[PDB]
Design a protein around this nucleic acid. Structure first.
Ligand SMILES: [Mg+2]
Ligand SMILES: [Mg+2]
Ligand SMILES: [Zn+2]
Length: 600
DNA sequence: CGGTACCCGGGCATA
DNA sequence: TTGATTTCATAACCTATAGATATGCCCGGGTACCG
RNA sequence: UCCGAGCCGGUUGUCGCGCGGUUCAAUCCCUGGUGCGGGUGCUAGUACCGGCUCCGCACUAUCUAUAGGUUAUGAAAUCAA
């Protein structure tokens, strides 16, 4: 739904200073964490075990049955007919998995509430993974087998006659993907290399829709594509391609957040009979453990604190549930011109990798937010070196790095991964049991939250209390270019909304190749200065980096007789912002986007 | 000392 | 003698998806009652 | 495999400028922010109220898990003996 909000808080403030209640929380979280970790591995183990027959269909009952068997073994006595069949089917494999990993049944009481949350959560991961990444992996497999990486050199670009492969590839993809029915005569033109691809893709047993393409079939029923998706991963390992985790695994040993609701509260925390809870108000139960008077539990926007929290022993996530909720190009500046004209001040931002934000007003005031500032303010860089030092001090790297790949689909290979993981499981848990690992995640949230708040506060001082942000449309929806650090591009579109700041998108086409002072894209030079590589390890290699953020104009109008360089130097980020002001100003004035910056 | 019926709590179902 | 290219493990940052609890009924085991 | 930000110049609205100078500001523990007050604290300018620091209270902040890409660390394989 879309009627919930969360106010994260620390463990100390969330829970009252009661040692008995606090100890149960940590003990309960650890038990649930183990079940979630082993259940995911158990789910994959069952799938791999049956790989030599019809693929087993995975439903909510399948994951739920595994969780109960691990916790209760044979003591689980479901009455649903469907669950009974899965219990017997999964029982031989669950016991076998425990032998490999040495798991011992905790026999936790009142598992149902935790089981249901984990069951849905684990089931969600399968749906999400198949829905989005199924198309990406299948398309990648077609490209890899055709050596599209090497086709760049074999068929050099900038030639018309060499588009045959690209045209050939596009036609084959439609036929292979079954989106378009091929001509029956085309089968005689298949090359031996392409012939194998057609048969291999057919073996995936990809579903079909009589009137819709795969783009809609996957969304309609992602679970139907799960059996094909698992076999697709096997093909990647069969030819050395970069493997992907088709079956999600909760590998991390750090205590994960485990949801604690009203029922779990009396079941395990308060340890009182169900009658004691049924006869007492829901708010009263939580007040005995959690300090509801704190800021985190306060209501907001008509959303009250219905009992639900996820904690990991260092931080607590307090959720607010709206009463009306179930009990259980529109963002571009072009289409929002009427609102922009009413803005007190308009700010244009050109995101980049290093200069994550570079803002400029109509008056020319300059402000920027750099990734280095996040590295210091957020503390991620500090938490990086220190994390490595602890790993080296405890000698976990010597053990952690040798773990066999978990993405393998072969049963024998996966068995080795479990054995190696068990080989040094005891040592690693002691290392990850340190409070620092969970402390860093909570501290990162505070520093990251504090850094974002400071960013908005600084912008308000320079740009006023209320302002409208017109950011460039460029953004990385994942798949960030290699050799470049991660950066926040689409996230800023959400941060402004949380702070009651309107955000709009603008096209950046040709915005970096126009001199604002003469409005001409002809006399512009790019990447003329050179110097040793700024990266210390690349500099030792002797590499030379051509300047990227420096631009200049050779037009006589911009030059002066007293100069010796012969160019009016400009900054890439600042130059882009200046062009945006001209583009935005023209559109606001009714003249539209200038032809200089148009895709003509 | 030896059999029967009512109630409490844990478990499981499913919207 | 020496250094260049692929894959994998553990953290993180963004980025995209989905779900973001509760009431009713079974049963079995402990007890109270009767001879 | 290492870096904070603003400003005065070398600049002309110039560069991961490992160019100079200059001011703050984070180095651990902390959920952040807007405002309407009073007070068990410490700070600078000519008693007034510029700075952090607390409660008490209206509103304002979605997060967990998984996965793709990427970054840091640690490992495996090949080509010339
Ligand atoms: Mg841009
Ligand atoms: Mg830029
Ligand atoms: Zn010019």
């Amino acid at each position: 739904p879309t009627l919930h909000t969360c106010n994260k808080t620390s463990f100390a403030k969330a829970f009252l200073p009661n040692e008995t209640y606090r100890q149960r929380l940590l003990d309960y979280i650890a038990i649930i964490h183990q079940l979630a970790d082993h259940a995911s591995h158990a789910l994959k183990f069952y799938i791999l075990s049956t790989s030599t027959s019809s693929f087993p269909v995975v439903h909510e009952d399948t994951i739920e049955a595994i969780l109960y068997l691990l916790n209760k073994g044979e003591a689980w006595h479901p009455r649903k007919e469907a669950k009974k069949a899965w219990r017997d089917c999964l029982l031989p494999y669950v016991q076998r998995y425990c032998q490999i990993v040495g798991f011992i049944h905790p026999n936790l009481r009142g598992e149902q509430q935790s089981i249901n949350y984990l069951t849905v959560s684990m089931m969600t991961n399968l749906k999400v993974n198949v829905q989005e990444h199924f198309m990406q992996m299948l398309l990648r497999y077609i490209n890899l087998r055709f050596d599209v990486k090497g086709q760049k050199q074999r068929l050099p670009p900038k030639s018309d006659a060499r588009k045959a492969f690209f045209t050939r590839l596009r036609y084959l993809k439609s036929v292979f993907l079954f989106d378009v029915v091929p001509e029956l005569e085309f089968l005689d033109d298949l090359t031996p290399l392409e012939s194998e691809v057609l048969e291999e893709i057919w073996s995936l047993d990809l579903p079909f829709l009589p009137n819709d393409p795969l783009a809609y079939a996957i969304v309609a029923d992602p679970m139907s594509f799960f059996p094909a998706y698992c076999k697709l991963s096997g093909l990647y390992e069969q030819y050395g391609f970069q493997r992907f985790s088709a079956i999600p695994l909760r590998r991390s040993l750090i205590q994960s957040h485990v949801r604690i609701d009203t029922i779990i509260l009396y079941q395990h925390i308060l340890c009182i009979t169900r009658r004691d809870a049924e006869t007492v108000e829901k708010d009263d139960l939580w007040m005995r453990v959690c300090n509801l008077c704190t800021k985190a539990f306060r209501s907001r926007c008509g959303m009250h604190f219905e009992g639900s929290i996820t904690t990991d022993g260092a931080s607590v996530s307090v959720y607010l549930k709206h009463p009306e909720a179930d009990k259980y190009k529109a963002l571009y500046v072009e289409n929002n011109l009427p609102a922009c004209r009413a803005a007190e001040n308009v700010v244009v931002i050109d995101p980049n990798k290093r200069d994550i934000l570079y803002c400029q007003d109509s008056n020319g005031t300059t402000f920027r937010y750099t990734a280095n500032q996040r590295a210091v303010e957020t503390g991620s860089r500090r938490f990086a070196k220190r994390r490595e030092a602890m790993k080296e001090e405890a000698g976990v790297d010597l053990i952690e790095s040798r773990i066999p790949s978990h993405k393998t689909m072969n049963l024998m290979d996966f068995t080795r991964y479990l054995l190696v993981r068990r080989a040094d499981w005891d040592r690693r848990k002691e290392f990850y049991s340190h409070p620092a690992h969970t402390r860093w995640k909570w501290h990162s949230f505070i520093n990251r939250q504090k850094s974002e708040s400071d960013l908005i506060s600084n912008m308000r001082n320079k740009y006023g209390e209320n302002f409208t942000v017109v950011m460039g449309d460029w953004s990385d929806a994942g798949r960030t270019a290699r050799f470049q650090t991660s950066s926040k591009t689409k996230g800023w579109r959400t941060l402004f909304k949380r702070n009651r700041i309107d955000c709009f998108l603008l096209d950046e086409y040709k915005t970096s190749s126009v001199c604002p002072r003469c409005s001409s894209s002809e006399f512009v030079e790019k990447k003329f200065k050179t110097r040793p590589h700024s990266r210390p390890w690349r500099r030792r290699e002797g590499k030379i980096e051509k300047v990227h953020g420096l631009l200049g104009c050779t037009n006589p109008n911009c030059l002066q007789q007293a100069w010796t360089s012969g160019m009016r130097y400009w900054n890439r980020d600042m130059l882009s912002t200046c062009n945006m002001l001209l583009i935005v100003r023209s559109m606001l004035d009714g003249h539209g986007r200038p032809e200089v910056f148009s895709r003509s």
